[PDB]
Design a protein around this ligand. Structure first.
Ligand SMILES: [Zn+2]
Ligand SMILES: [Zn+2]
Length: 194
């Protein structure tokens, strides 16, 4: 059960600080934020400290820069979650992706530039729907309801509906929450029940 004899971030050896939960080892200048020096007691590495993901990510859409944590800028990615529709597209931390979706993460890496974010895809509440969604690569039909196919009740009992989304094949239907203001949503709910 040895540790890495080289900093994970910079691949070089020397003064190393080793995680007590995993064999990772880092150079204090390499971590973000950098640490003053060797801390007292246990120390868990940035990949051991990393929080788990809310679900499983289906597709990475976009990435952005963010403000450095409080003592180098980190990075967040706009993700499409597997099983949930584009209304649930969230932002996740770069190291979350590498830890839990490595091959997918590195596949994205190989294709694009990771110094400058990709350009926005421009081709009522549209001006905002363009803000959270459309510019990142979400074709606006993918957030429009085509059909309500079925309903379901969970442990708590909040009803879920299985929605077929427009210009998105049935294989990517999605169980959606009751309390979300989709355009038209409750009008199709009444059609389904009535
Ligand atoms: Zn660790
Ligand atoms: Zn290093």
């Amino acid at each position: 059960d040895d540790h890495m004899e080289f900093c994970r971030v910079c691949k070089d050896g020397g003064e190393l600080l080793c995680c007590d939960a995993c064999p990772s080892s880092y150079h204090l200048h390499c971590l973000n934020p950098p640490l003053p020096e060797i801390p007292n007691g246990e120390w868990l590495c940035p990949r051991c400290t990393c929080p788990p993901l809310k679900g499983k990510v289906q597709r990475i859409l976009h990435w952005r820069w963010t403000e450095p944590p409080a003592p180098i800028p980190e990075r967040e990615f706009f993700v499409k979650w597997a099983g949930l529709s584009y209304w649930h597209c969230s932002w996740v931390k770069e190291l979350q992706l590498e830890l839990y979706h490595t091959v997918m993460y590195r596949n994205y890496q190989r294709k694009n530039d990771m110094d400058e974010p990709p350009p926005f895809d421009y081709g009522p509440l549209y001006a905002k729907m363009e803000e959270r969604f459309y510019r990142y690569g979400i074709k606006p039909e993918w957030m429009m309801i085509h059909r309500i196919l079925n309903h379901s009740f969970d442990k708590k009992g909040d009803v879920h509906y299985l929605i077929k989304w427009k210009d998105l094949p049935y294989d990517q239907c999605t169980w959606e929450i009751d309390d979300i203001d989709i355009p038209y949503y409750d009008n199709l709910k009444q059609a389904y029940w009535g």
